[PDB]
């Protein structure tokens, strides 16, 4: 049919990256589009705010949508600023939180995996911390969060489930299993309750 089988009820990871790329990020421009007091074509986009793009001043931090920050970072015309949660100190704090509370997930942003991957691939030289350590802490967080998920998929009842603080990519990859096992355990229950 119109929509392929693997896109039926889930999002392909490319679509998750597409969704994440619409979030604003803070950049240090390497150009200056701010018209002086004393021609030029303005952005005038339709799905975001062009105000922060027509007023870029070199080495003056602004906020632009991520898919534009990446487009400028394709050249040497900007420098993506890593979010505060993507530092070694904060990653260590989150890892300690995960190791301290074995029943609930840490408060990482919903796009932490996708943003980490995108920034590590396209902005590998804009981190105040060694990227070889940020990768090693992102992987550690992913491992701990995977251990907690496998021990909660052991609570797949037929009423509901509270996956608090879970990210977006993790939810996306767990959707076809959780939402298809709970459906079967609900069909069994409703068949039993046919009286």
């Amino acid at each position: 049919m119109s929509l392929p089988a693997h896109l039926q009820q889930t999002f392909s990871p490319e679509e998750i990256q597409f969704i994440v790329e619409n979030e604003p990020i803070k950049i240090f421009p390497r150009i200056t589009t701010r018209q002086k007091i004393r021609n030029h074509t303005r952005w005038q986009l339709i799905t975001t705010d062009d105000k922060a793009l027509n007023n870029m001043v070199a080495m003056r931090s602004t906020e632009v949508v991520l898919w534009i920050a990446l487009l400028l970072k394709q050249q040497s015309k900007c420098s993506i600023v890593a979010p505060q949660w993507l530092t070694t100190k904060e990653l260590d704090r989150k890892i300690q939180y995960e190791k301290t509370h074995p029943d609930r997930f840490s408060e990482l942003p919903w796009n932490w995996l996708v943003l980490a991957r995108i920034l590590f691939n396209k902005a590998k030289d804009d981190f105040h911390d060694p990227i070889h350590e940020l990768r090693g802490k992102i992987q550690d967080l992913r491992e701990i969060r995977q251990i907690k998920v496998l021990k909660g998929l052991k609570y797949l009842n037929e009423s509901h489930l509270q996956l608090d603080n879970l990210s977006l990519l993790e939810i996306n990859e767990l959707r076809p299993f959780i939402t298809e096992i709970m459906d079967k355990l609900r069909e069994i229950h409703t068949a039993s309750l046919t009286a």
Binding site: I37, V57, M59, R60, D125, H128
Partner: protein, 284 residues
């Protein structure tokens, strides 16, 4: 260090001391603004008495320890060195109106953002300042100077050295800030920024086309700080304190808000005086 048309230099000698001089050569008019005037920068003397770790090499590189003399986006000279405090020239246009205002306190800001520790492993290498935007590399380690892969110029905001340690250690160990003094510091920042912007408004003209709007927003925040301080004074039932603070209000709508604060914060006597101020402003 020189701007587009103006040159700023610091002269040091063993007999005359640290004397600066800001001379604007100009396209066709060598208009002078200062000459050999004394400056308040603190030369490193105690810290140079054979008690330092990894700073000896840098002090050998620069005997006076002055890191930079960068200007501002509006031509305001700025000084950075061992004391780790910026030094701006607020009313630099008039030689008689010379004003050396410490606008930033690097050590204090670093401490209040570090979580509580008096960390020394963080060193600030300033590059430039532009209207609260101080671009400076924050090297982490025992080496003050950066390496070849120059780090991203992280930005720091200007803050007066009004932060008192006694007040800041209320929550001894996101460092908490005393709200009573935070609004006063915001008042001071808005005041100095408005004064600096007014100097370049009529003289240097419009720079980006938005100086008037940012000045208006800054004045709004300036009067909001006055309103908060007025409410704080009224909280102590000191009518004379609020009356004295109300004479610096700029917008009349903020003065009406002050009337409401007086009429609501258990101060009926302040109502008449603030109304009298408003009625005087009717004819002013």
């Amino acid at each position: 260090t020189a701007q587009n048309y103006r040159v700023f230099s610091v002269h040091y000698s063993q007999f005359h001391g640290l004397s600066y001089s800001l001379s604007e050569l100009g396209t066709s008019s060598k208009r002078y603004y200062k000459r050999e005037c004394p400056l308040p920068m603190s030369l490193p003397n105690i810290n140079s008495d054979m008690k330092k770790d990894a700073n000896l090499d840098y002090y050998n590189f620069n005997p006076m320890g002055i890191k930079s003399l960068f200007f501002s986006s509006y031509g305001d000279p700025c000084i950075f060195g061992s004391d780790n405090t910026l030094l701006l020239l607020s009313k630099w246009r008039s030689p008689e109106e010379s004003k050396w205002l410490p606008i930033l306190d690097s050590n204090m800001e670093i401490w209040k953002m570090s979580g509580g520790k008096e960390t020394t492993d963080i060193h600030v290498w300033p590059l430039a300042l532009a209207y609260d935007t101080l671009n400076c590399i924050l090297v982490k380690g025992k080496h003050i100077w950066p390496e070849f892969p120059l780090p991203l110029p992280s930005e720091m905001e200007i803050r007066m050295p009004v932060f008192v340690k006694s007040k800041l250690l209320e929550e001894n160990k996101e460092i908490q800030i005393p709200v009573s003094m935070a609004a006063e510091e915001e008042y001071l920042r808005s005041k100095v920024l408005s004064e600096l912007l007014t100097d370049t408004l009529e003289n240097d003209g419009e720079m980006y086309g938005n100086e008037n709007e940012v000045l208006a927003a800054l004045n709004g925040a300036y009067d909001k700080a006055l309103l908060r301080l007025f409410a704080s004074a009224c909280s102590d039932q000191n009518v004379e304190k609020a009356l004295s603070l109300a004479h610096e209000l700029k917008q009349d709508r903020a003065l009406t808000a002050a009337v409401k604060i007086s009429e609501r914060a258990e101060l009926p006597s302040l109502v008449k005086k603030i109304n009298n101020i408003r009625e005087a402003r009717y004819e002013q």
